[PDB]
Design a protein around this nucleic acid. Sequence first.
RNA 1: CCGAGGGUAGGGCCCGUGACUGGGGCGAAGUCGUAACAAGGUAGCUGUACCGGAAGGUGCGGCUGGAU
RNA 2: UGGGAGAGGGUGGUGGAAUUCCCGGAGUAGCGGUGAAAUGCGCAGAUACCGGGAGGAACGCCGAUGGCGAAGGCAGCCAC
RNA 3: CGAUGUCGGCUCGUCGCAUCCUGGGGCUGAAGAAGGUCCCAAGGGUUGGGCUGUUCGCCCAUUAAAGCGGCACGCGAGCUG
RNA 4: GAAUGCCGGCAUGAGUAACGAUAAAGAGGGUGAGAAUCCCUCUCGCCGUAAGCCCAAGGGUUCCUACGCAAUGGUCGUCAGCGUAGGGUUAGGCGGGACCUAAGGUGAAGCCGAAAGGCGUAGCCGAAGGGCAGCCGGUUAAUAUUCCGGCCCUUCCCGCAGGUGCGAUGGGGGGACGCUCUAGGCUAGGGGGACCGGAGCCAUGGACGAGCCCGGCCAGAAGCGCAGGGUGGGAGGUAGGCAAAUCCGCCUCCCAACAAGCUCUGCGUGGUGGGGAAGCCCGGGUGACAACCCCCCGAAGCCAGGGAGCCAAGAAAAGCCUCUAAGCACAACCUGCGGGAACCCGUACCGCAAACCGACACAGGUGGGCGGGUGCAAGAGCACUCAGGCGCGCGGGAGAACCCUCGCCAAGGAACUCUGCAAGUUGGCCCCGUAACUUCGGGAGAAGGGGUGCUCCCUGGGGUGAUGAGCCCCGGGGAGCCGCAGUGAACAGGCUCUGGCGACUGUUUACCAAAAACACAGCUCUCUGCGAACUCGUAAGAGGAGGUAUAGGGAGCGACGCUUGCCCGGUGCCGGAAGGUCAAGGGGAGGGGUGCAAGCCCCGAACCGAAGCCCCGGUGAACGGCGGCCGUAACUAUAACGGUCCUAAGGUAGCGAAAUUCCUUGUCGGGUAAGUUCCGACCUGCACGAAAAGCGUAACGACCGGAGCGCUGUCUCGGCGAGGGACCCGGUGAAAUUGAACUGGCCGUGAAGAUGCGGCCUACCCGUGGCAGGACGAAAAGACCCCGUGGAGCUUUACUGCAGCC
RNA 5: GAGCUAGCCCUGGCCAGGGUGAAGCUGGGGUGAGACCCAGUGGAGGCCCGAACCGGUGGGGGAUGCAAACCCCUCGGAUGA
RNA 6: UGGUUCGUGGAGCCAUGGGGGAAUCUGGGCGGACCACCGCCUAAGGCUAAGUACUCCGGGUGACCGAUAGCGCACCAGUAC
Lengths: 275, 48
Amino acid sequence: AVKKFKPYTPSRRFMTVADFSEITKTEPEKSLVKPLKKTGGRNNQGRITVRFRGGGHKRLYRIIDFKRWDKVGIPAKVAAIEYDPNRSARIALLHYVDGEKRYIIAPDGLQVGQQVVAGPDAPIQVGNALPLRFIPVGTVVHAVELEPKKGAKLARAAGTSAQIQGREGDYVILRLPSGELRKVHGECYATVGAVGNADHKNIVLGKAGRSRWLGRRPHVRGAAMNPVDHPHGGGEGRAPRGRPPASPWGWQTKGLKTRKRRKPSSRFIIARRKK
Amino acid sequence: MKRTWQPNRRKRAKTHGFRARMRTPGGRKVLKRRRQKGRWRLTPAVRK
RNA sequence: CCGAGGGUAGGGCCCGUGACUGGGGCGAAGUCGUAACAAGGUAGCUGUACCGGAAGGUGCGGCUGGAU
RNA sequence: UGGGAGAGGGUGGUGGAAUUCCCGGAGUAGCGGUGAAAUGCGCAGAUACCGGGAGGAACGCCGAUGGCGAAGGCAGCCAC
RNA sequence: CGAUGUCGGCUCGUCGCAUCCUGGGGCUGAAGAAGGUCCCAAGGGUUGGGCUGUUCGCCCAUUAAAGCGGCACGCGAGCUG
RNA sequence: GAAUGCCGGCAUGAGUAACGAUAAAGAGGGUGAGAAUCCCUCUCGCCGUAAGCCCAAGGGUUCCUACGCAAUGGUCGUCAGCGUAGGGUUAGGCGGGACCUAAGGUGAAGCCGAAAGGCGUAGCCGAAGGGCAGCCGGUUAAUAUUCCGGCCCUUCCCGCAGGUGCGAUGGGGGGACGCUCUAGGCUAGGGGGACCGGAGCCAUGGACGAGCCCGGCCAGAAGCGCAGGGUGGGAGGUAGGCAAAUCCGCCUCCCAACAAGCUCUGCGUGGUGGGGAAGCCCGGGUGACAACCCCCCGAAGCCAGGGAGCCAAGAAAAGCCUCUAAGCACAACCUGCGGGAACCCGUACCGCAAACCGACACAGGUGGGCGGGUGCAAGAGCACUCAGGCGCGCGGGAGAACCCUCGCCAAGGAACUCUGCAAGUUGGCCCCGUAACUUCGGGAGAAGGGGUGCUCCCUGGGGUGAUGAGCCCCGGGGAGCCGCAGUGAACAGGCUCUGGCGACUGUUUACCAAAAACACAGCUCUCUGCGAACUCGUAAGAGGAGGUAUAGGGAGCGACGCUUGCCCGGUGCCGGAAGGUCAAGGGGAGGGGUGCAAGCCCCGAACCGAAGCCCCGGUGAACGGCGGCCGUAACUAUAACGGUCCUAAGGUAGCGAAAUUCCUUGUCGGGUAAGUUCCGACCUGCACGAAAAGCGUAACGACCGGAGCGCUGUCUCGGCGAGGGACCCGGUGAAAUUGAACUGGCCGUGAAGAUGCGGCCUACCCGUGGCAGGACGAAAAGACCCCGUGGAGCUUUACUGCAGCC
RNA sequence: GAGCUAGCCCUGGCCAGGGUGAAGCUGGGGUGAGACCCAGUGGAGGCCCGAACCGGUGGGGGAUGCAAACCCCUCGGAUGA
RNA sequence: UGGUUCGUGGAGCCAUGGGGGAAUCUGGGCGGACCACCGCCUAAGGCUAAGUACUCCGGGUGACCGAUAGCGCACCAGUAC
Ligand SMILES: CC[C@H]1OC(=O)[C@H](C)C(=O)[C@H](C)[C@@H](O[C@@H]2O[C@H](C)C[C@H](N(C)C)[C@H]2O)[C@@H](C)C[C@@H](C)C(=O)/C=C/[C@]1(C)O
Ligand SMILES: [K+]
Ligand SMILES: [Mg+2]
Ligand SMILES: [Mg+2]
Ligand SMILES: [Mg+2]
Ligand SMILES: [Mg+2]
Ligand SMILES: [Mg+2]
Ligand SMILES: [Mg+2]
Ligand SMILES: [Mg+2]
Ligand SMILES: [Mg+2]
Ligand SMILES: [Mg+2]
Ligand SMILES: [Mg+2]
Ligand SMILES: [Mg+2]
Ligand SMILES: [Mg+2]
Ligand SMILES: [Mg+2]
Ligand SMILES: [Mg+2]
Ligand SMILES: [Mg+2]
Ligand SMILES: [Mg+2]
Ligand SMILES: [Mg+2]
Ligand SMILES: [Mg+2]
Ligand SMILES: [Mg+2]
Ligand SMILES: [Mg+2]
Ligand SMILES: [Mg+2]
Ligand SMILES: [Mg+2]
Ligand SMILES: [Mg+2]
Ligand SMILES: [Mg+2]
Ligand SMILES: [Mg+2]
Ligand SMILES: [Mg+2]
Ligand SMILES: [Mg+2]
Ligand SMILES: [Mg+2]
Ligand SMILES: [Mg+2]
Ligand SMILES: [Mg+2]
Ligand SMILES: [Mg+2]
Ligand SMILES: [Mg+2]
Ligand SMILES: [Mg+2]
Ligand SMILES: [Mg+2]
Ligand SMILES: [Mg+2]
Ligand SMILES: [Mg+2]
Ligand SMILES: [Mg+2]
Ligand SMILES: [Mg+2]
Ligand SMILES: [Mg+2]
Ligand SMILES: [Mg+2]
Ligand SMILES: [Mg+2]
Ligand SMILES: [Mg+2]
Ligand SMILES: [Mg+2]
Ligand SMILES: [Mg+2]
Ligand SMILES: [Mg+2]
Ligand SMILES: [Mg+2]
Ligand SMILES: [Mg+2]
Ligand SMILES: [Mg+2]
Ligand SMILES: [Mg+2]
Ligand SMILES: [Mg+2]
Ligand SMILES: [Mg+2]
Ligand SMILES: [Mg+2]
Ligand SMILES: [Mg+2]
Ligand SMILES: [Mg+2]
Ligand SMILES: [Mg+2]
Ligand SMILES: [Mg+2]
Ligand SMILES: [Mg+2]
Ligand SMILES: [Mg+2]
Ligand SMILES: [Mg+2]
Ligand SMILES: [Mg+2]
Ligand SMILES: [Mg+2]
Ligand SMILES: [Mg+2]
Ligand SMILES: [Mg+2]
Ligand SMILES: [Mg+2]
Ligand SMILES: [Mg+2]
Ligand SMILES: [Mg+2]
Ligand SMILES: [Mg+2]
Ligand SMILES: [Mg+2]
Ligand SMILES: [Mg+2]
Ligand SMILES: [Mg+2]
Ligand SMILES: [Mg+2]
Ligand SMILES: [Mg+2]
Ligand SMILES: [Mg+2]
Ligand SMILES: [Mg+2]
Ligand SMILES: [Mg+2]
Ligand SMILES: [Mg+2]
Ligand SMILES: [Mg+2]
Ligand SMILES: [Mg+2]
Ligand SMILES: [Mg+2]
Ligand SMILES: [Mg+2]
Ligand SMILES: [Mg+2]
Ligand SMILES: [Mg+2]
Ligand SMILES: [Mg+2]
Ligand SMILES: [Mg+2]
Ligand SMILES: [Mg+2]
Ligand SMILES: [Mg+2]
Ligand SMILES: [Mg+2]
Ligand SMILES: [Mg+2]
Ligand SMILES: [Mg+2]
Ligand SMILES: [Mg+2]
Ligand SMILES: [Mg+2]
Ligand SMILES: [Mg+2]
Ligand SMILES: [Mg+2]
Ligand SMILES: [Mg+2]
Ligand SMILES: [Mg+2]
Ligand SMILES: [Mg+2]
Ligand SMILES: [Mg+2]
Ligand SMILES: [Mg+2]
Ligand SMILES: [Mg+2]
Ligand SMILES: [Mg+2]
Ligand SMILES: [Mg+2]
Ligand SMILES: [Mg+2]
Ligand SMILES: [Mg+2]
Ligand SMILES: [Mg+2]
Ligand SMILES: [Mg+2]
Ligand SMILES: [Mg+2]
Ligand SMILES: [Mg+2]
Ligand SMILES: [Mg+2]
Ligand SMILES: [Mg+2]
Ligand SMILES: [Mg+2]
Ligand SMILES: [Mg+2]
Ligand SMILES: [Mg+2]
Ligand SMILES: [Mg+2]
Ligand SMILES: [Mg+2]
Ligand SMILES: [Mg+2]
Ligand SMILES: [Mg+2]
Ligand SMILES: [Mg+2]
Ligand SMILES: [Mg+2]
Ligand SMILES: [Mg+2]
Ligand SMILES: [Mg+2]
Ligand SMILES: [Mg+2]
Ligand SMILES: [Mg+2]
Ligand SMILES: [Mg+2]
Ligand SMILES: [Mg+2]
Ligand SMILES: [Mg+2]
Ligand SMILES: [Mg+2]
Ligand SMILES: [Mg+2]
Ligand SMILES: [Mg+2]
Ligand SMILES: [Mg+2]
Ligand SMILES: [Mg+2]
Ligand SMILES: [Mg+2]
Ligand SMILES: [Mg+2]
Ligand SMILES: [Mg+2]
Ligand SMILES: [Mg+2]
Ligand SMILES: [Mg+2]
Ligand SMILES: [Mg+2]
Ligand SMILES: [Mg+2]
Ligand SMILES: [Mg+2]
Ligand SMILES: [Mg+2]
Ligand SMILES: [Mg+2]
Ligand SMILES: [Mg+2]
Ligand SMILES: [Mg+2]
Ligand SMILES: [Mg+2]
Ligand SMILES: [Mg+2]
Ligand SMILES: [Mg+2]
Ligand SMILES: [Mg+2]
Ligand SMILES: [Mg+2]
Ligand SMILES: [Mg+2]
Ligand SMILES: [Mg+2]
Ligand SMILES: [Mg+2]
Ligand SMILES: [Mg+2]
Ligand SMILES: [Mg+2]
Ligand SMILES: [Mg+2]
Ligand SMILES: [Mg+2]
Ligand SMILES: [Mg+2]
Ligand SMILES: [Mg+2]
Ligand SMILES: [Mg+2]
Ligand SMILES: [Mg+2]
Ligand SMILES: [Mg+2]
Ligand SMILES: [Mg+2]
Ligand SMILES: [Mg+2]
Ligand SMILES: [Mg+2]
Ligand SMILES: [Mg+2]
Ligand SMILES: [Mg+2]
Ligand SMILES: [Mg+2]
Ligand SMILES: [Mg+2]
Ligand SMILES: [Mg+2]
Ligand SMILES: [Mg+2]
Ligand SMILES: [Mg+2]
Ligand SMILES: [Mg+2]
Ligand SMILES: [Mg+2]
Ligand SMILES: [Mg+2]
Ligand SMILES: [Mg+2]
Ligand SMILES: [Mg+2]
Ligand SMILES: [Mg+2]
Ligand SMILES: [Mg+2]
Ligand SMILES: [Mg+2]
Ligand SMILES: [Mg+2]
Ligand SMILES: [Mg+2]
Ligand SMILES: [Mg+2]
Ligand SMILES: [Mg+2]
Ligand SMILES: [Mg+2]
Ligand SMILES: [Mg+2]
Ligand SMILES: [Mg+2]
Ligand SMILES: [Mg+2]
Ligand SMILES: [Mg+2]
Ligand SMILES: [Mg+2]
Ligand SMILES: [Mg+2]
Ligand SMILES: [Mg+2]
Ligand SMILES: [Mg+2]
Ligand SMILES: [Mg+2]
Ligand SMILES: [Mg+2]
Ligand SMILES: [Mg+2]
Ligand SMILES: [Mg+2]
Ligand SMILES: [Mg+2]
Ligand SMILES: [Mg+2]
Ligand SMILES: [Mg+2]
Ligand SMILES: [Mg+2]
Ligand SMILES: [Mg+2]
Ligand SMILES: [Mg+2]
Ligand SMILES: [Mg+2]
Ligand SMILES: [Mg+2]
Ligand SMILES: [Mg+2]
Ligand SMILES: [Mg+2]
Ligand SMILES: [Mg+2]
Ligand SMILES: [Mg+2]
Ligand SMILES: [Mg+2]
Ligand SMILES: [Mg+2]
Ligand SMILES: [Mg+2]
Ligand SMILES: [Mg+2]
Ligand SMILES: [Mg+2]
Ligand SMILES: [Mg+2]
Ligand SMILES: [Mg+2]
Ligand SMILES: [Mg+2]
Ligand SMILES: [Mg+2]
Ligand SMILES: [Mg+2]
Ligand SMILES: [Mg+2]
Ligand SMILES: [Mg+2]
Ligand SMILES: [Mg+2]
Ligand SMILES: [Mg+2]
Ligand SMILES: [Mg+2]
Ligand SMILES: [Mg+2]
Ligand SMILES: [Mg+2]
Ligand SMILES: [Mg+2]
Ligand SMILES: [Mg+2]
Ligand SMILES: [Mg+2]
Ligand SMILES: [Mg+2]
Ligand SMILES: [Mg+2]
Ligand SMILES: [Mg+2]
Ligand SMILES: [Mg+2]
Ligand SMILES: [Mg+2]
Ligand SMILES: [Mg+2]
Ligand SMILES: [Mg+2]
Ligand SMILES: [Mg+2]
Ligand SMILES: [Mg+2]
Ligand SMILES: [Mg+2]
Ligand SMILES: [Mg+2]
Ligand SMILES: [Mg+2]
Ligand SMILES: [Mg+2]
Ligand SMILES: [Mg+2]
Ligand SMILES: [Mg+2]
Ligand SMILES: [Mg+2]
Ligand SMILES: [Mg+2]
Ligand SMILES: [Mg+2]
Ligand SMILES: [Mg+2]
Ligand SMILES: [Mg+2]
Ligand SMILES: [Mg+2]
Ligand SMILES: [Mg+2]
Ligand SMILES: [Mg+2]
Ligand SMILES: [Mg+2]
Ligand SMILES: [Mg+2]
């Protein structure tokens, strides 16, 4: 769990990598991948709309099953656990007794060779998927649909988890990975357990070059630019911001709430986020 | 040192060529003007 | 060949000494407070941590070498 | 070999009292605090009372001058 | 101001004299030696170094002496930067 | 007659600079009206990981031959990439199309936009990626995997034979993949041979020799051999692969699992077809019936989709195999054989350059492959050389100053200078040895030394082969020889001590700045619950992301260590269903106009009425800020201490004459003979200070300070020598500039610095090589500075609007 | 107008040779078992030296240039951002 | 909000982006806010020659040019570059 290195180079001093101990298959399923078109941050106009993207490692997309309710009552064996470069979680390859194969994001505690199943009847065991209304209150859970049949949306990053606090009406109350308390419909599926690879957050990139491999190009401070470029531009020598800290587009970036006031979801959010 | 003109037959006909001018209103006005001035060639030569 | 020693370079140990700096001891009648000895007027002491002109204070845990 | 007491250790679970916050109700002119006050909180509806919800910590009675451990130390209850 | 390149250093001089040294003098509170002060004198001479961009100055070791000033603060179609 | 006017023409500078790498030339013969320059020969020199040879791009006849020399060629020209004419590029297999998909572009359906237009799944287009059949030699003045020779191969059509449930733009398999390291066996390529073949050679003192010199191959179907790649076989069930399916997928059972078998490539052999040198003759003949063998080195290439380890987790689609649906099983497909058919476009030539990009026959720039040998530890490094290619399209003399590039130097050795700038020194390999400090990796090639050639003798292990000889790679030991000197030549660190800044490798002002600046791992704040926030767009649509709070955006700080204090009064942001103010709208007290009148029309107070602002709170790794004056101790001095005024609060730790200190070279210490710099200290900090972070910090740095050693032409202080220029002769022949010129010194005068005025002095006429004081010398209508009710970038609590948001 | 230049997207290619010797594995020691130690093996890395290639540090030359950014000597990176 | 001479003006008229929303002659618009009288005209469908504009083209004519003029072009010019 997080391997360090000897300081035999200045960058190896602090660079740490994952242990990869839970991986059991080093190549993807040839029928479950398709090429992932790198955007480099540029949109259909050819315009940079997200800055500092691009130049990272070539990748293939693993088609993940964020529905699960496709195959109610059809068990599947956990055949392997693999690396996916498109998310922080690991992925679990499932051989359905159908002969169908699919990926799910691999929760913590999963083990190759066990069995998983989805549906109202499913037992409350790591890997099983159920509509939220059938899962006991207080269960930790991931891959939650935000609306019935729309796809697992919440709790998908490595180590994240959501907890069913209680129920009212057709809706159940979850505490999200951000500490938010939110109502989600009871028909919404979810999978029990937390997402695996929790040590993902203790990784130290270690050098500039590791951000580049991930496609993260260098971020330039507004204070290093000129008035034409950014509200923090200019100054003779260094300069404090000398005005409320703004983004490149001039909106304040220190506390200014940006969520839309009249949003229809506000009726389903019980309490804003945590720390 | 390396200079600005680096000829490329494929780049030429795809940027200034006849079929490129006909795809936009601005390119068509070029040819309209260029015809109206009696220019002997509407479009740069490139040997395909 | 060896060789007293001379020469070159680099280490180790000890002694003297140094602008200045740190506390220590001692010094009949200096300044500031009053922490301990009575429950010493907030019981004291304690390891540690933080803080404060100073003795000290305070938090956590501990001891009775604590009075009623 | 056959037995016996015990807060001895570790892991995993789990119960109620109470404090705090938030929601709702009902209700009004102060609450809180000290040696005495004041800061503070309260008509933007506090305190006191009821209902619900969220969370963390410590285990009241039994508890004793008691028991266990090499010492430090170990106290709700359940299982290994 | 349709441009007179601006500090200092180097190189290369040349001039003035209110003379730093050498030469000639008077006065001296000039015994001697060595000084003080003024007069005459521009022929020649007027060192090497440490610090600083420095001019200047301070210091070290000497010296007969280690002079002051001018020449677009002499000298960038001569160099340095 | 002037506009630094416009256009043209012609002068000055001037027979001046220059003639484009310092790789280099000389002679003989020839051609021609004419020759340093063209052709031929010999001699010399230069490149040889190229300055040699293939390929691609770009260029577009420049290629070959004949005849020419006006211009082009920096001179010449008889020559040429020039002029005229004639000739030259040949493919089922090479490259591209009639095949595939990539980003991207386009775009049925569909969406959007005043118009023009913008998007957009499928589809289609799009290549140097995938896929797909030719190798050797010969021939031409000029093309050749293209013509010809030999030996091979593919696809389409039709036929015959045999086989089979045939059949597709649909299902499935496959195609199908990274980086680093790398095994086995081969080939490419190279080295040696006492062997095989070869025209000759014996010089000049010796050698007739195991002598010298030249050469000892290439391609090749099936089969076979060696080395490798891919690959389980059978049955039962099936609900999944958007219909079907015997294929695939999943489960169960049997058999076989480092194999074998089957299959596909590489290499070898292989019927057969080729090639074949020095030398000597005149590109050709001969050599020649040429020989065509053994040994060794050996890839980065091949077998290959090989293996291992690793994290950053490494295209698609067709060809192809298989599965079946309609349909059809007189068909259709598969296999083999045979004949027939096989289209379009490119192909010349230059191609690190005189033919491409740079206005030039321009010292610049331009992607891929091959790139020999010997020695130096390796190598594509360095030196020399093969093959092949050149001597750079002005030359001949001379032997000045001065310039560039280069060599050396007595004694001294940084005294030079802003600075050791520059140049010395050091220099590879092997062995010995190697400090503070440290994050234990390092600092480290620290430092400092010793060795290095050749001959003879003995000796150890390795690859090949076989276990031996031979060949080849690594050594150990002993005795000697020579020189000033043995990495004898070329290529190849000077070192240390101590400060500042920045952790680090990186990045940057193309073309005056490479840095301390930017970035950077890491830290904190804050926003965002997904049709996310945010960003681009009028929009649709996109990016964010086929991601989901261990995620994503924004901001500051900048590895790491130890830390980051107090102030929320003002601005910002966060919260606050009360209160105040609040526009449209609601309301309608009450007036007004007009009409004979019902009516029509106008204005209008209270009162309700959003966000915003006001108001009450919170909030600093949010904008920011963090006092003054007076007094006090048993010597003096200084104040732990007290007084009072003010503030929102009064700068904590740490550091300090500092990249910050004005006074200032502060003061004291160190270093020095001497230290405005440097280091260490003190603290009256003009005017440090804690994420515009504070203080340290091993390692790192073409950064910037200070010092020492070494060593030097930097210097005292210069001298000599080399080449390339300058100089002279022959050839060609510019430039800016230029009112006109018959254009001297001084002292004056003058718009205040006079060749040109006054007075005096000096001076025969004209040049060449030189130096730069003047012609307020040339160049650029001064960038500084001011002015203009000139302009542009940028800012904000300047004004007024706009997008955006509420 | 992105045939220059800046960034990104798709698909290809390139980086002689030498040095250092991480994790891992193996063996030995050690212990109750361990950690840990030693040796061999291995071949990591914005590691080290140095061509090609990419740069442009310092000086000199050039300055109507060979060149509207060049030449020479010196120097940086050279498996990687 | 646009048009008109009309820039919010006492601002009608014409047109229309939004909200409300009739009537068929005893219906409706206008005569510069509005009201009355007096008058003018019949919206929410369409077409319609001529008289007006211009000169790529062809003629005729100049107190128009005469090769630096007149078109950029008298000529192989939108060419060479
Ligand atoms: C590299 C070569 C060029 O020269 C220069 O760059 C040198 C460094 C210059 O300084 C030049 C001479 C500039 O001239 C100076 O400009 C100053 C503001 C004013 C000076 N003047 C006495 C006051 C004046 O001499 C320049 C404005 C004039 C140029 C355009 C010029 O005419 C020639 C330029 C060169 C020769 O190409
Ligand atoms: K100025
Ligand atoms: Mg590490
Ligand atoms: Mg390691
Ligand atoms: Mg894992
Ligand atoms: Mg794949
Ligand atoms: Mg696929
Ligand atoms: Mg981007
Ligand atoms: Mg696009
Ligand atoms: Mg586009
Ligand atoms: Mg962005
Ligand atoms: Mg993963
Ligand atoms: Mg829901
Ligand atoms: Mg990546
Ligand atoms: Mg940054
Ligand atoms: Mg800046
Ligand atoms: Mg801009
Ligand atoms: Mg701005
Ligand atoms: Mg600013
Ligand atoms: Mg800036
Ligand atoms: Mg700035
Ligand atoms: Mg500043
Ligand atoms: Mg700045
Ligand atoms: Mg700031
Ligand atoms: Mg400010
Ligand atoms: Mg701002
Ligand atoms: Mg916003
Ligand atoms: Mg929230
Ligand atoms: Mg180009
Ligand atoms: Mg092309
Ligand atoms: Mg092309
Ligand atoms: Mg192109
Ligand atoms: Mg083109
Ligand atoms: Mg024509
Ligand atoms: Mg055109
Ligand atoms: Mg002696
Ligand atoms: Mg006390
Ligand atoms: Mg006391
Ligand atoms: Mg007490
Ligand atoms: Mg006591
Ligand atoms: Mg105090
Ligand atoms: Mg306290
Ligand atoms: Mg206590
Ligand atoms: Mg007591
Ligand atoms: Mg009220
Ligand atoms: Mg002036
Ligand atoms: Mg002038
Ligand atoms: Mg001038
Ligand atoms: Mg001038
Ligand atoms: Mg005298
Ligand atoms: Mg006298
Ligand atoms: Mg006397
Ligand atoms: Mg004199
Ligand atoms: Mg001085
Ligand atoms: Mg001066
Ligand atoms: Mg001074
Ligand atoms: Mg004297
Ligand atoms: Mg003066
Ligand atoms: Mg001067
Ligand atoms: Mg001068
Ligand atoms: Mg100059
Ligand atoms: Mg000067
Ligand atoms: Mg001059
Ligand atoms: Mg001069
Ligand atoms: Mg300077
Ligand atoms: Mg006139
Ligand atoms: Mg002129
Ligand atoms: Mg003019
Ligand atoms: Mg003119
Ligand atoms: Mg002219
Ligand atoms: Mg003349
Ligand atoms: Mg002339
Ligand atoms: Mg002339
Ligand atoms: Mg002339
Ligand atoms: Mg002359
Ligand atoms: Mg010239
Ligand atoms: Mg020249
Ligand atoms: Mg000769
Ligand atoms: Mg002739
Ligand atoms: Mg000739
Ligand atoms: Mg001739
Ligand atoms: Mg060679
Ligand atoms: Mg051309
Ligand atoms: Mg040819
Ligand atoms: Mg002729
Ligand atoms: Mg000619
Ligand atoms: Mg001629
Ligand atoms: Mg002639
Ligand atoms: Mg000519
Ligand atoms: Mg000629
Ligand atoms: Mg020429
Ligand atoms: Mg030809
Ligand atoms: Mg042809
Ligand atoms: Mg053929
Ligand atoms: Mg070809
Ligand atoms: Mg066809
Ligand atoms: Mg296609
Ligand atoms: Mg389109
Ligand atoms: Mg296309
Ligand atoms: Mg292709
Ligand atoms: Mg062949
Ligand atoms: Mg012929
Ligand atoms: Mg068959
Ligand atoms: Mg079939
Ligand atoms: Mg098929
Ligand atoms: Mg590929
Ligand atoms: Mg890797
Ligand atoms: Mg071969
Ligand atoms: Mg060899
Ligand atoms: Mg010979
Ligand atoms: Mg195999
Ligand atoms: Mg022959
Ligand atoms: Mg014969
Ligand atoms: Mg493999
Ligand atoms: Mg595709
Ligand atoms: Mg039939
Ligand atoms: Mg055809
Ligand atoms: Mg053709
Ligand atoms: Mg050809
Ligand atoms: Mg040529
Ligand atoms: Mg060629
Ligand atoms: Mg080149
Ligand atoms: Mg090439
Ligand atoms: Mg030439
Ligand atoms: Mg050239
Ligand atoms: Mg070669
Ligand atoms: Mg070597
Ligand atoms: Mg050359
Ligand atoms: Mg030449
Ligand atoms: Mg000459
Ligand atoms: Mg001469
Ligand atoms: Mg000599
Ligand atoms: Mg000599
Ligand atoms: Mg010497
Ligand atoms: Mg010395
Ligand atoms: Mg010395
Ligand atoms: Mg110097
Ligand atoms: Mg200095
Ligand atoms: Mg220095
Ligand atoms: Mg040297
Ligand atoms: Mg050397
Ligand atoms: Mg160490
Ligand atoms: Mg050494
Ligand atoms: Mg040595
Ligand atoms: Mg010898
Ligand atoms: Mg063997
Ligand atoms: Mg020697
Ligand atoms: Mg070296
Ligand atoms: Mg300093
Ligand atoms: Mg740096
Ligand atoms: Mg640091
Ligand atoms: Mg740092
Ligand atoms: Mg850094
Ligand atoms: Mg620059
Ligand atoms: Mg610039
Ligand atoms: Mg430039
Ligand atoms: Mg420069
Ligand atoms: Mg700079
Ligand atoms: Mg640099
Ligand atoms: Mg920068
Ligand atoms: Mg930090
Ligand atoms: Mg926008
Ligand atoms: Mg999206
Ligand atoms: Mg997407
Ligand atoms: Mg930075
Ligand atoms: Mg910073
Ligand atoms: Mg430390
Ligand atoms: Mg505040
Ligand atoms: Mg505030
Ligand atoms: Mg407040
Ligand atoms: Mg309204
Ligand atoms: Mg009336
Ligand atoms: Mg309001
Ligand atoms: Mg403030
Ligand atoms: Mg302060
Ligand atoms: Mg404080
Ligand atoms: Mg503190
Ligand atoms: Mg100080
Ligand atoms: Mg300061
Ligand atoms: Mg100072
Ligand atoms: Mg100062
Ligand atoms: Mg001083
Ligand atoms: Mg001293
Ligand atoms: Mg200091
Ligand atoms: Mg002081
Ligand atoms: Mg500061
Ligand atoms: Mg700040
Ligand atoms: Mg600052
Ligand atoms: Mg510091
Ligand atoms: Mg440090
Ligand atoms: Mg340290
Ligand atoms: Mg650096
Ligand atoms: Mg640097
Ligand atoms: Mg010299
Ligand atoms: Mg010479
Ligand atoms: Mg000529
Ligand atoms: Mg005249
Ligand atoms: Mg005259
Ligand atoms: Mg005057
Ligand atoms: Mg005068
Ligand atoms: Mg005169
Ligand atoms: Mg006159
Ligand atoms: Mg007169
Ligand atoms: Mg006169
Ligand atoms: Mg005279
Ligand atoms: Mg002459
Ligand atoms: Mg002359
Ligand atoms: Mg002159
Ligand atoms: Mg002058
Ligand atoms: Mg002008
Ligand atoms: Mg002017
Ligand atoms: Mg100007
Ligand atoms: Mg300027
Ligand atoms: Mg002014
Ligand atoms: Mg004004
Ligand atoms: Mg004015
Ligand atoms: Mg203005
Ligand atoms: Mg402006
Ligand atoms: Mg580009
Ligand atoms: Mg391009
Ligand atoms: Mg490389
Ligand atoms: Mg090793
Ligand atoms: Mg490296
Ligand atoms: Mg350079
Ligand atoms: Mg460059
Ligand atoms: Mg140098
Ligand atoms: Mg220049
Ligand atoms: Mg160069
Ligand atoms: Mg060089
Ligand atoms: Mg290197
Ligand atoms: Mg390398
Ligand atoms: Mg008005
Ligand atoms: Mg109006
Ligand atoms: Mg109106
Ligand atoms: Mg009717
Ligand atoms: Mg009527
Ligand atoms: Mg009516
Ligand atoms: Mg109307
Ligand atoms: Mg009306
Ligand atoms: Mg009317
Ligand atoms: Mg009226
Ligand atoms: Mg009318
Ligand atoms: Mg009508
Ligand atoms: Mg008409
Ligand atoms: Mg008409
Ligand atoms: Mg006519
Ligand atoms: Mg006429
Ligand atoms: Mg004419
Ligand atoms: Mg005319
Ligand atoms: Mg015309
Ligand atoms: Mg003309
Ligand atoms: Mg043209
Ligand atoms: Mg022409």
